[PDB]
DNA sequence: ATGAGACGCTGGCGATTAGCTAATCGCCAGCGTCTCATCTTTATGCGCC
């Protein structure tokens, strides 16, 4: 079962991945601004954890093959 | 009062492996008899409401 096919490369391409997204959304979604020259939100990016969301999965019977 | 979450060559070959109707034409077709009787029907020939 542990074949393990992943190689390093693929997780700092995560890492990569995740760094331009979060500031091309972070532009993207957020168009108007306020009055004293800030981004209006109507749309908020959430950055949640990969701990948060296993451990949630582990902690509740809800697991996942 | 820390220790899980992230899993391969396949497609494109050969080369097995397996299996099937169809289109063209030819051949060749159980048959032999008699008796006996039986009925019809036809060709021609003869008659007026």
């Given at each position: ?10 997780l ?17 979604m ?36």
């Amino acid at each position: 079962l542990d074949k393990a096919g992943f190689i390093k490369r693929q997780l700092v391409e995560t890492r990569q991945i995740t760094k331009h997204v979060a500031q091309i959304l972070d532009s993207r979604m957020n168009t108007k601004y306020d009055e004293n020259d800030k981004l209006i939100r109507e749309v908020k990016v959430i950055t949640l954890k990969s701990k948060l969301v296993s451990d949630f999965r582990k902690d509740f019977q809800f697991y996942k093959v």
